[PDB]
Ligand binder design. Sequence first.
Ligand code: HEM
Ligand SMILES: O=C1N[C@@H](Cc2c[nH]c3ccccc23)C(=O)N[C@H]1Cc1ccc(O)cc1
Length: 394
Amino acid sequence: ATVLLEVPFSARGDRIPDAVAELRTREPIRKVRTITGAEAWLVSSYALCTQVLEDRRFSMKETAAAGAPRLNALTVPPEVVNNMGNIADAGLRKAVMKAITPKAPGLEQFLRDTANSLLDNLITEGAPADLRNDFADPLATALHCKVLGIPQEDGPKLFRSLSIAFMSSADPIPAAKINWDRDIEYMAGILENPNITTGLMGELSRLRKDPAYSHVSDELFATIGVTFFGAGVISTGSFLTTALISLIQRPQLRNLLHEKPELIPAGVEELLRINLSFADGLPRLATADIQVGDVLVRKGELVLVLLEGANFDPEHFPNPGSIELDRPNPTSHLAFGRGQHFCPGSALGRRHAQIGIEALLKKMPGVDLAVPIDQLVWRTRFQRRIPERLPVLW
Ligand code: HEM
Ligand SMILES: O=C1N[C@@H](Cc2c[nH]c3ccccc23)C(=O)N[C@H]1Cc1ccc(O)cc1
């Protein structure tokens, strides 16, 4: 006898397990057990993943309900699971989007200058260089301090909450509450700081004193700063790091993008499509009995939308494991989700990766791993798949 199939399958972000294609072909919706011991429905085909993400009766908000089957323990207060919904209800959605667009004056130049300075420092120090700790993550942190309008010197401390805040744990994490409360106090101070007049926090500070937003809570304003810094920095730093591995493992593509940097945006879209940065399926709780393929999902059950299940589906993306720059449906992947909860930082994440890759290929055209690929150490029980260090030479 064997136990019910457990998720996640592997923390490695450099290869997709053969099990994904097996489940997609044989049982594209099937029962699994999560790290908490709960049962869930794992969805692995493009058609069924899109159906779940486009039906709001599969609720993100309701995954925080007490007594629900859980993918993992909350690392934020339960109301914060519905963060975007709370922002929209407060009439702040348009202002938040305008603040996080990569089109802001001087933002792209700031990204280029920061990426170039980090790379120059690595070249001065000499090989090996760690592209996660000394490139991708500081570039993501610097970008988010600029987008938020907060001091660059405050970035490293806010960043150090992330290795705990984005854990995917069976049980509550005491350190996550200590760091959450401290980071909220910091953002509350930023709202009261007269020097903070630019970026997302400068805009929220002004809207907070506008009569049209007098009843929006101070708790929500501080929460927007903590959540957008954390989600943006963990997502951009982790995606860029794993996209750099995908590129280093494809020297023909690396050489083509070095030669023709105008192809970098199409290259980043394929790197997003094949990305294995999300460690778990996206969770949703059914609020009704809903038919998904051969399964009638019952009200109160947990559904997990496996992004790599959809993104590597050959019925939607033929030769799914290959980076092809001329696909006819290039942005139809689910790397940023789909539907009600589609990533609000999609344009900024694309620009962060495009500029980081453009700068790296110009400065280090001979970039290569400095250790055999199996020697990368993959972070476990985390909401993202990332190597602890990414040692390279050039
Ligand atoms: C490469 C970069 C990024 C990737 C791959 C990524 C991916 C995703 C995905 C897949 C979702 C959907 C989650 C779901 O439906 O359960 C999401 C949501 C979200 N992301 Fe991103 N993200 C990235 C960058 C960012 C950035 C830069 C920010 C903010 C500065 C951000 C803020 C958020 C927030 C707040 C949500 C929740 C939206 C909602 O509930 O409506 N993301 N992201
Ligand atoms: O469940 C998630 N799902 C995805 C999407 C998401 C869902 N709800 C969110 C609220 C705020 C920011 C992001 C989200 C994610 O990026 N993060 C986590 C939420 C999160 C946010 C901030 C933390 O310190 C810890 C956890």
